[PDB]
Design an enzyme around this catalytic site. Structure first.
Site, PDB file in Angstrom:
ATOM      1  CG  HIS A 172      39.004   5.164  -2.816  1.00  0.00           C
ATOM      2  ND1 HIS A 172      37.953   4.364  -2.418  1.00  0.00           N
ATOM      3  CD2 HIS A 172      40.068   4.790  -2.066  1.00  0.00           C
ATOM      4  CE1 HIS A 172      38.377   3.534  -1.477  1.00  0.00           C
ATOM      5  NE2 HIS A 172      39.652   3.776  -1.242  1.00  0.00           N
ATOM      6  CG  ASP A 202      34.458   3.928  -4.105  1.00  0.00           C
ATOM      7  OD1 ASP A 202      35.062   2.828  -4.062  1.00  0.00           O
ATOM      8  OD2 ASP A 202      34.717   4.884  -3.370  1.00  0.00           O
ATOM      9  CB  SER A 235      38.093   2.742   2.117  1.00  0.00           C
ATOM     10  OG  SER A 235      38.118   1.679   1.148  1.00  0.00           O
TER      11      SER A 235
END
Length: 345
Positions: free
Chosen positions: A289, A243, A145
């Site tokens: 994710h 995502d 991330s």
């Protein structure tokens, strides 16, 4: 199994001025080092950073960090959980700077918070050199991330650091997981948040990308498809085509009607397009994710190849494509979970 070390240079700090740090599990005899950058969004002004300090304080302070963490996924030392690098020296660098690992600003007189992400990475590397990193053959800078974007922003700086410190034999490489975002149109209603964050953080981007985009436009370098072609270190890109954080910033929340169906299909197709010329990549057609530090990271496959396998093939490629050992794995099917191996939820 990973033990906390707070930085010996206590001027390199989390947002609230507490020392930054790293968790380490050494593997004697291994000359491979995995340094993983944690993610967790960012904050870009006093008011939103103050809110993050009330209810997300571990992302802004080391005061409450535990003595140890368990390595999971790519940070696991068990071959069953980590077929790729289970014997490596493992480092988990907590994200406590809220700056996408870009900042170089201390707390002071003018600054309520310190944004030192780029300096945290540099200082971790510094201090690890005295703990066995000096003997490394490969330093894989990985992250998820905001930590994945942090890899893109910092991998070449780590390479330059080691060169200037006199360690030209350490091969620095990057693994950017779930950090490859598009500055696209929202479906209803990041670019502006990043512009403001850069000023607030004193944020820094890689030099070649900075030279292309120039002052005022360094925010462009936070977008993988723009910064990646400027990088010299080998970088493997892991990115779900759909995502969840991309969809959140796009104001998409999931019976889907035509407008949203077209929006989602176009997003996947744009993501695929940006990865066409990325030779080391793993991009499954899933709504999800992050992947690399999840215990079941081994389960997803693209074209019959798992991510641990693709990463192993990448290692071999860095010793002409390899028979049965592919490194470029991008799904072509156009809708979330058209790949049957997508995470179930």
């Amino acid at each position: 199994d990973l033990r906390l070390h707070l930085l010996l240079n206590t001027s390199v700090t989390c947002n609230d001025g507490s020392p930054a740090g790293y968790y380490l599990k050494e593997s004697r005899g291994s000359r491979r080092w995995l340094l993983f950058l944690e993610g967790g969004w960012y904050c870009f002004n006093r008011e939103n950073c103050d809110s993050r300090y009330d209810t997300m304080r571990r992302l802004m302070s080391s005061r409450d960090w535990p003595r140890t963490r368990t390595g999971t996924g790519i940070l696991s030392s068990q071959p069953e959980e980590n077929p790729y690098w289970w014997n490596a020296n493992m480092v988990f660098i907590p994200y406590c700077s809220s700056d996408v690992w870009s900042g170089a600003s201390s707390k002071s007189e003018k600054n309520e918070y310190a944004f030192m992400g780029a300096l945290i990475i540099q200082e971790v590397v510094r201090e690890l050199l005295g703990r066995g990193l000096s003997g490394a053959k490969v330093l894989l800078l990985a992250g998820s991330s905001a930590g994945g974007t942090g890899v893109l922003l910092n991998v070449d700086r780590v390479a330059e650091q080691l060169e200037k410190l006199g360690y030209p034999a350490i091969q620095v490489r990057g693994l950017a997981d779930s950090g490859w975002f598009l500055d696209n149109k929202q479906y209803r209603h990041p670019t502006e948040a990043i512009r403001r964050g850069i000023r607030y953080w004193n944020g820094v981007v890689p030099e070649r990308c900075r030279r292309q985009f120039q002052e005022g436009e360094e925010w462009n370098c936070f977008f993988g498809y723009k910064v990646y072609p400027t990088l010299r270190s080998p970088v493997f890109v892991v990115q779900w085509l759909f995502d969840e954080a991309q969809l959140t910033v796009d104001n998409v929340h999931l019976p889907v009607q035509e407008g949203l169906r077209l929006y989602i299909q176009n997003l996947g197709r744009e993501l695929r397009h940006t990865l066409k010329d990325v030779p080391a990549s793993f991009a499954p057609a899933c709504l999800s994710h992050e992947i690399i530090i999840r215990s079941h990271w081994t389960d997803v496959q693209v074209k019959g190849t798992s991510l641990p396998r693709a990463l192993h093939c990448w290692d071999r490629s860095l010793h002409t494509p390899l028979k049965g050992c592919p490194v470029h794995l991008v799904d072509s099917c156009p809708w979330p979970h058209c790949n049957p191996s997508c995470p179930t939820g």
